[PDB]
Structure formats: structure tokens, C-alpha cells
Amino acid sequence: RAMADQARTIRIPVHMVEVINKLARVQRQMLQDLGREPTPEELAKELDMTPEKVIEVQKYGREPISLHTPLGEDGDSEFGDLIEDS
């Protein structure tokens, strides 16, 4: 429960985290057994949900990048120095 509540900067409810974990485990097992990357339809029929829900669950789980990652070869610039204030 604690890892479900204190593991992501953008918090997700417990049930959505459980769904994400289930989808990740199913995808890993399918990739291992089949030998190829499962398509969204294969997971959708395996997980008993629409492909839109599958892609939404995949999208929700991503980790934000950091603005301080250096991209200058000499070590002077940062990823956050090239973002325009829209």
C-alpha cells in the first residue's frame, strides 16, 4: 500500500496502480513466451478490455524526465534550458 501511495510524483489511485502492474506482468509474460512484442489487440483480448483502455493504462504509468539532465557534451547546458515558455 505504501509503495502504491508514495512511489510516483503524480500520484495514481491504488486500483489504477494494480491495473498497471497487471498489464505490465501480462505484457512481460507474453513477450517472453511468444518471442515477439505483443500488439495492442493481443493484450486487449488477453486482458479483456478495449485497446483504448490498454493504451491509456500504458500512458498513465510513465515517469517524468528531469529538467537537469545534461545534453551538452562539454557539460554546460541542460534539458530545461531549451524549453520555451509558451
Partner DNA sequence: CCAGATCGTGCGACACACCGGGCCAATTGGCCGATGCCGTCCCGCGAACCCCTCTACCGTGTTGAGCAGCAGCGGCCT
Cα separation, 16 vs 4, whole angstroms: 10
Asked whether position 13 contacts DNA by CB under 7 A, the answer is yes
Residues 79, 66 contacting (CB under 8 angstroms): yes
Q: What is the size of the binding site for DNA (CB under 7 A)? A: 5
- Contact pick of 9, 15, 33, 83 for DNA (by CB under 7 A): 15
> Quick one: which segment of 13-21, 27-35, 36-44, 63-71 binds DNA (CB under 7 A)?
13-21
* Alpha helices per DSSP H over 1-86: 2-5, 14-34, 40-47, 51-60
Q: Tell me: does residue 14 bind DNA (CB under 7 A).
A: yes
Determine, following the binding rule CB under 7 A, whether residue 7 of this chain makes contact with DNA: no
Contact 26, 47 (CB under 8 A): yes
Minimal distance, residue 50 CB to DNA, in Å: 11
Interface residues with DNA (CB under 7 A)? Answer: 1, 13-16
